[PDB]
Design an enzyme around this catalytic site. Structure first.
Site, PDB file in Angstrom:
ATOM      1  N   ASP A  45      16.831   4.350  -4.673  1.00  0.00           N
ATOM      2  CA  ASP A  45      16.095   3.102  -4.518  1.00  0.00           C
ATOM      3  C   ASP A  45      16.285   2.145  -5.689  1.00  0.00           C
ATOM      4  O   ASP A  45      15.773   1.021  -5.642  1.00  0.00           O
ATOM      5  CB  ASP A  45      14.601   3.395  -4.357  1.00  0.00           C
TER       6      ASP A  45
ATOM      7  N   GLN B 251       8.080   6.429  -1.900  1.00  0.00           N
ATOM      8  CA  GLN B 251       7.709   5.235  -1.163  1.00  0.00           C
ATOM      9  C   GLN B 251       6.533   4.550  -1.862  1.00  0.00           C
ATOM     10  O   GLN B 251       5.602   5.204  -2.324  1.00  0.00           O
ATOM     11  CB  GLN B 251       7.372   5.602   0.279  1.00  0.00           C
TER      12      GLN B 251
ATOM     13  N   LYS C  11      13.247   5.415   8.352  1.00  0.00           N
ATOM     14  CA  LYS C  11      14.292   5.967   7.494  1.00  0.00           C
ATOM     15  C   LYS C  11      14.673   7.376   7.935  1.00  0.00           C
ATOM     16  O   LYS C  11      15.845   7.767   7.859  1.00  0.00           O
ATOM     17  CB  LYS C  11      13.841   5.974   6.029  1.00  0.00           C
TER      18      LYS C  11
HETATM   19  N1  LIG Z   1       6.767  -3.208  -0.168  1.00  0.00           N
HETATM   20  C1  LIG Z   1       6.904  -2.824   1.111  1.00  0.00           C
HETATM   21  O1  LIG Z   1       6.624  -1.725   1.577  1.00  0.00           O
HETATM   22  C2  LIG Z   1       7.440  -3.865   2.041  1.00  0.00           C
HETATM   23  C3  LIG Z   1       7.798  -3.498   3.328  1.00  0.00           C
HETATM   24  C4  LIG Z   1       8.292  -4.450   4.203  1.00  0.00           C
HETATM   25  C5  LIG Z   1       8.419  -5.752   3.781  1.00  0.00           C
HETATM   26  N2  LIG Z   1       8.073  -6.084   2.521  1.00  0.00           N
HETATM   27  C6  LIG Z   1       8.243  -7.517   2.129  1.00  0.00           C
HETATM   28  O2  LIG Z   1       8.901  -7.612   0.916  1.00  0.00           O
HETATM   29  C7  LIG Z   1       8.385  -8.762   0.172  1.00  0.00           C
HETATM   30  C8  LIG Z   1       7.931  -8.444  -1.274  1.00  0.00           C
HETATM   31  O3  LIG Z   1       7.654  -7.105  -1.646  1.00  0.00           O
HETATM   32  P1  LIG Z   1       6.204  -6.576  -2.267  1.00  0.00           P
HETATM   33  O4  LIG Z   1       5.193  -6.559  -1.143  1.00  0.00           O
HETATM   34  O5  LIG Z   1       6.542  -5.333  -3.023  1.00  0.00           O
HETATM   35  O6  LIG Z   1       5.738  -7.805  -3.296  1.00  0.00           O
HETATM   36  P2  LIG Z   1       4.256  -8.138  -3.965  1.00  0.00           P
HETATM   37  O7  LIG Z   1       3.902  -7.170  -5.058  1.00  0.00           O
HETATM   38  O8  LIG Z   1       3.332  -8.328  -2.791  1.00  0.00           O
HETATM   39  O9  LIG Z   1       4.528  -9.608  -4.651  1.00  0.00           O
HETATM   40  C9  LIG Z   1       4.807 -10.736  -3.850  1.00  0.00           C
HETATM   41  C10 LIG Z   1       5.551 -11.752  -4.690  1.00  0.00           C
HETATM   42  O10 LIG Z   1       5.409 -13.035  -4.081  1.00  0.00           O
HETATM   43  C11 LIG Z   1       4.680 -13.883  -4.916  1.00  0.00           C
HETATM   44  N3  LIG Z   1       3.736 -14.785  -4.282  1.00  0.00           N
HETATM   45  C12 LIG Z   1       2.515 -14.542  -3.704  1.00  0.00           C
HETATM   46  N4  LIG Z   1       1.930 -15.619  -3.268  1.00  0.00           N
HETATM   47  C13 LIG Z   1       2.798 -16.639  -3.571  1.00  0.00           C
HETATM   48  C14 LIG Z   1       2.759 -18.040  -3.375  1.00  0.00           C
HETATM   49  N5  LIG Z   1       1.736 -18.662  -2.781  1.00  0.00           N
HETATM   50  N6  LIG Z   1       3.796 -18.767  -3.807  1.00  0.00           N
HETATM   51  C15 LIG Z   1       4.815 -18.162  -4.418  1.00  0.00           C
HETATM   52  N7  LIG Z   1       4.964 -16.861  -4.652  1.00  0.00           N
HETATM   53  C16 LIG Z   1       3.925 -16.139  -4.212  1.00  0.00           C
HETATM   54  C17 LIG Z   1       3.980 -13.019  -5.971  1.00  0.00           C
HETATM   55  O11 LIG Z   1       4.080 -13.760  -7.124  1.00  0.00           O
HETATM   56  P3  LIG Z   1       3.433 -13.154  -8.607  1.00  0.00           P
HETATM   57  O12 LIG Z   1       4.549 -12.284  -9.155  1.00  0.00           O
HETATM   58  O13 LIG Z   1       3.221 -14.479  -9.347  1.00  0.00           O
HETATM   59  O14 LIG Z   1       2.183 -12.414  -8.151  1.00  0.00           O
HETATM   60  C18 LIG Z   1       4.918 -11.810  -6.091  1.00  0.00           C
HETATM   61  O15 LIG Z   1       5.839 -11.878  -7.154  1.00  0.00           O
HETATM   62  C19 LIG Z   1       7.308  -9.379   1.070  1.00  0.00           C
HETATM   63  O16 LIG Z   1       7.931 -10.361   1.857  1.00  0.00           O
HETATM   64  C20 LIG Z   1       6.870  -8.189   1.943  1.00  0.00           C
HETATM   65  O17 LIG Z   1       6.236  -8.466   3.167  1.00  0.00           O
HETATM   66  C21 LIG Z   1       7.588  -5.180   1.654  1.00  0.00           C
HETATM   67  N1  LIG Z   2      10.281   3.046  -2.577  1.00  0.00           N
HETATM   68  C1  LIG Z   2      10.198   1.988  -1.596  1.00  0.00           C
HETATM   69  N2  LIG Z   2       9.002   1.570  -1.179  1.00  0.00           N
HETATM   70  C2  LIG Z   2       8.938   0.603  -0.282  1.00  0.00           C
HETATM   71  N3  LIG Z   2       7.646   0.141   0.165  1.00  0.00           N
HETATM   72  C3  LIG Z   2      10.119   0.069   0.211  1.00  0.00           C
HETATM   73  N4  LIG Z   2      10.237  -0.984   1.184  1.00  0.00           N
HETATM   74  C4  LIG Z   2      10.575  -0.689   2.556  1.00  0.00           C
HETATM   75  O1  LIG Z   2      10.684   0.438   2.918  1.00  0.00           O
HETATM   76  N5  LIG Z   2      10.718  -1.854   3.414  1.00  0.00           N
HETATM   77  C5  LIG Z   2      11.028  -1.868   4.831  1.00  0.00           C
HETATM   78  C6  LIG Z   2      11.077  -3.101   5.480  1.00  0.00           C
HETATM   79  C7  LIG Z   2      11.382  -3.155   6.830  1.00  0.00           C
HETATM   80  C8  LIG Z   2      11.653  -1.977   7.524  1.00  0.00           C
HETATM   81  C9  LIG Z   2      12.011  -2.062   9.003  1.00  0.00           C
HETATM   82  O2  LIG Z   2      12.430  -1.124   9.606  1.00  0.00           O
HETATM   83  N6  LIG Z   2      11.864  -3.347   9.639  1.00  0.00           N
HETATM   84  C10 LIG Z   2      12.215  -3.523  11.025  1.00  0.00           C
HETATM   85  C11 LIG Z   2      11.029  -3.142  11.911  1.00  0.00           C
HETATM   86  C12 LIG Z   2       9.671  -3.630  11.394  1.00  0.00           C
HETATM   87  C13 LIG Z   2       8.588  -3.500  12.475  1.00  0.00           C
HETATM   88  N7  LIG Z   2       7.248  -3.727  12.334  1.00  0.00           N
HETATM   89  N8  LIG Z   2       6.671  -3.490  13.537  1.00  0.00           N
HETATM   90  N9  LIG Z   2       7.594  -3.130  14.400  1.00  0.00           N
HETATM   91  N10 LIG Z   2       8.789  -3.124  13.775  1.00  0.00           N
HETATM   92  C14 LIG Z   2      12.593  -5.005  11.091  1.00  0.00           C
HETATM   93  O3  LIG Z   2      12.197  -5.758  10.146  1.00  0.00           O
HETATM   94  O4  LIG Z   2      13.301  -5.469  12.039  1.00  0.00           O
HETATM   95  C15 LIG Z   2      11.641  -0.749   6.878  1.00  0.00           C
HETATM   96  C16 LIG Z   2      11.318  -0.696   5.527  1.00  0.00           C
HETATM   97  C17 LIG Z   2      11.339   0.544  -0.244  1.00  0.00           C
HETATM   98  O5  LIG Z   2      12.538   0.001   0.240  1.00  0.00           O
HETATM   99  N11 LIG Z   2      11.333   1.501  -1.137  1.00  0.00           N
END
Ligand SMILES: NC(=O)c1ccc[n+]([C@@H]2O[C@H](COP(=O)([O-])OP(=O)(O)OC[C@H]3O[C@@H](n4cnc5c(N)ncnc54)[C@H](OP(=O)(O)O)[C@@H]3O)[C@@H](O)[C@H]2O)c1
Ligand SMILES: Nc1nc(N)c(NC(=O)Nc2ccc(C(=O)N[C@@H](CCc3nnn[nH]3)C(=O)O)cc2)c(=O)[nH]1
Ligand SMILES: NC(=O)c1ccc[n+]([C@@H]2O[C@H](COP(=O)([O-])OP(=O)(O)OC[C@H]3O[C@@H](n4cnc5c(N)ncnc54)[C@H](OP(=O)(O)O)[C@@H]3O)[C@@H](O)[C@H]2O)c1
Ligand SMILES: Nc1nc(N)c(NC(=O)Nc2ccc(C(=O)N[C@@H](CCc3nnn[nH]3)C(=O)O)cc2)c(=O)[nH]1
Lengths: 286, 286
Positions: A123, A98, A54
């Site tokens: 956000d 974050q 970011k």
């Molecule tokens: N937060 C970050 O920094 C970040 C960054 C990059 C990518 N992401 C992606 O964004 C997505 C979600 O954000 P989060 O990590 O904030 O969510 P989270 O709190 O990890 O919750 C995940 C959600 O998916 C559900 N889930 C888990 N296992 C499941 C299953 N077997 N079947 C159906 N649903 C299931 C959970 O359901 P319940 O509500 O029933 O527990 C929950 O609502 C994910 O794909 C994650 O990798 C997040």
């Molecule tokens: N307050 C607050 N809290 C939070 N946690 C979040 N979530 C958040 O920031 N999500 C997030 C997801 C993907 C990426 C990204 O840049 N993805 C690239 C490269 C990935 C990669 N991995 N390894 N190499 N490259 C790609 O997916 O292509 C950046 C940020 C928010 O939005 N707000």
């Protein structure tokens, strides 16, 4: 095979638009620059990466982004003092915390986030902003960045949303739950699934639109996809490489449009944050 | 055929428990009593009817309920005066604005609604309370009264909500949209339908739990209901007699449980408001 939605490329377009917008707004108003603050608690590895991606995007565009890293030993009261200062700093047009907060202490995340003044809540994580989007008051709130990015990817297919059945898998505060609200007021019929959903596979199969935010690596199988469906994969999972929440290889066989991981949702997340910060910078001037 | 979920008899249980709850408060803390205020704009016949229903119920329970009726010609600036006065009146524990406003002047409902102090928003209409509910922070908000009362009805079946597929028909701010959130955070898989929803008969036919809040007399036909479904009808429709949004006869032949119209959701809505009023008055003592 499905057309890949190119988030890395779609977002380039947006960031070029935003940069030009910011340069106009500096010619039109001298000495003024959009200012962003990202507050981090603790020292998570993945939080370091996304925060810094970011920071890069804000530099390429012209936004002034500041990064404040608090120790894992910080208290809830310490975090509030920072939020408090940022709220009243009339030069900061938007900040965010974050998530998740990585503190050894016990900190009420909801209390912290809800102390953010809604005019700076780029956000979209205050109850105030979430309540407006959850009731279809969409033109006076900030919408969470990842759901904003996803809608944009959906619109790029040309397939109108209205009348389509969307499945959202996951109900998180930042992604799954606001993603349901966005699709509903875009007149899709929305079904929301989660970890207590029975027969997930058959629910996923009703999805004309499918947005998966589970954080379970490749848990959603390709056989589950409705033939011809628009698949949106928010997953970012580190495994023995980076995978999404959908088994990409088999899903691309039945989808009509699919997002690769990485290079799909994630860059679009970052861009939509930049868009919301320019918008709140404008809203300050007016 | 189906067991009938008796809103008359169930609401009477809760009012009495509220009543005895009040009586013990008045013995424990001498003089104190819960005060509710209802504000009305215009002179709609139906709002007059329902407001009076609430007045009667508050009277039975020991809740002091004041009704303030502003004329059709009032200005948004006039309503704002009264809302601010109620917010500041320390002997008022909760207050609501009966919707929809009836006014010759074009008054911003959302501006009016969102000025109510959230600690007194017993109708769960402030954006602050909508967003806590929509994101699962259920311990700090007033849930809207009609969804509360459907939830209480669905619990009377003894059949757990978690895991079932629930179909909410309608997305209004007062019923539809908040019903989705309640069912979702009781762990149903929830489909929300509306007017751009195609093949409603088939989305309905997925409901283990079916809530219908369309205002479209008997539009959900009994033949669409899944056998064994729990059917909740929020409708009140005056026709050639009162009828609901569901085709009662045919639906009764297939549901396991079903709400009569009238005598179903209606008295449960009133009882929930009183319960919310007593709760905000309790929170005020402390
Ligand atoms: N937060 C970050 O920094 C970040 C960054 C990059 C990518 N992401 C992606 O964004 C997505 C979600 O954000 P989060 O990590 O904030 O969510 P989270 O709190 O990890 O919750 C995940 C959600 O998916 C559900 N889930 C888990 N296992 C499941 C299953 N077997 N079947 C159906 N649903 C299931 C959970 O359901 P319940 O509500 O029933 O527990 C929950 O609502 C994910 O794909 C994650 O990798 C997040
Ligand atoms: N307050 C607050 N809290 C939070 N946690 C979040 N979530 C958040 O920031 N999500 C997030 C997801 C993907 C990426 C990204 O840049 N993805 C690239 C490269 C990935 C990669 N991995 N390894 N190499 N490259 C790609 O997916 O292509 C950046 C940020 C928010 O939005 N707000
Ligand atoms: N509000 C009151 O004071 C009151 C009093 C007594 C009873 N009720 C009952 O409680 C419910 C409350 O409705 P409301 O007045 O709060 O909201 P409303 O503005 O009447 O909205 C009704 C909802 O039903 C949906 N809908 C309408 N026709 C439909 C169709 N053919 N197929 C699918 N969906 C359809 C609409 O979808 P869109 O969003 O796309 O329009 C809308 O979301 C109704 O059943 C009503 O009879 C209300
Ligand atoms: N802010 C705000 N604004 C709003 N509009 C509402 N809505 C609302 O109050 N709805 C409502 C509907 C029915 C009844 C009821 O008591 N129903 C009984 C008898 C009905 C009957 N009597 N004669 N014919 N039908 C029955 O159906 O059995 C009570 C309340 C709100 O809650 N908050």
């Amino acid at each position: 095979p499905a057309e890949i939605l190119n988030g890395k490329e779609i977002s380039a377009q947006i960031r070029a638009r935003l940069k030009n917008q910011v340069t106009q707004l500096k010619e039109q108003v001298p000495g003024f620059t959009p200012r962003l603050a990202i507050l981090q608690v603790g020292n998570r590895d993945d939080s370091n990466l996304y925060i810094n991606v970011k920071l890069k995007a804000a530099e390429e565009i012209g936004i002034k982004a500041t990064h404040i890293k608090l120790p894992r030993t910080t208290t809830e009261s310490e975090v509030m003092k920072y939020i408090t200062s940022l709220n009243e700093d009339s030069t900061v047009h938007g900040f965010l915390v974050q998530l998740p907060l990585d503190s050894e202490n016990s900190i009420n995340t909801e209390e912290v986030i809800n102390a953010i003044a809604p005019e700076k809540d780029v956000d979209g994580l205050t109850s105030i902003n979430a309540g407006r989007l959850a009731r279809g008051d969409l033109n006076d709130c900030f919408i969470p960045c990842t759901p904003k990015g996803c809608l944009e990817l959906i619109k790029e297919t040309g397939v109108p949303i209205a009348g389509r059945h969307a499945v959202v898998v996951g109900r998180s505060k930042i992604v799954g739950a606001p993603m349901h609200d966005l699709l509903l007021w875009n007149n899709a019929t929305v079904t929301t699934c989660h970890s207590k959903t029975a027969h997930l596979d058959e629910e996923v199969n009703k999805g004309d639109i499918l947005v998966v935010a589970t954080g379970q690596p490749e848990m959603v199988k390709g056989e589950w996809i409705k033939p011809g469906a628009i698949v949106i994969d928010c997953g970012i999972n580190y495994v023995p490489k980076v995978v999404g929440d959908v088994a990409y290889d088999e899903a691309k066989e039945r989808a009509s449009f699919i997002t690769p991981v990485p290079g799909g949702v994630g860059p679009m997340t970052v861009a939509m944050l930049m868009q919301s910060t320019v918008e709140s910078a404008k809203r300050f001037l007016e």
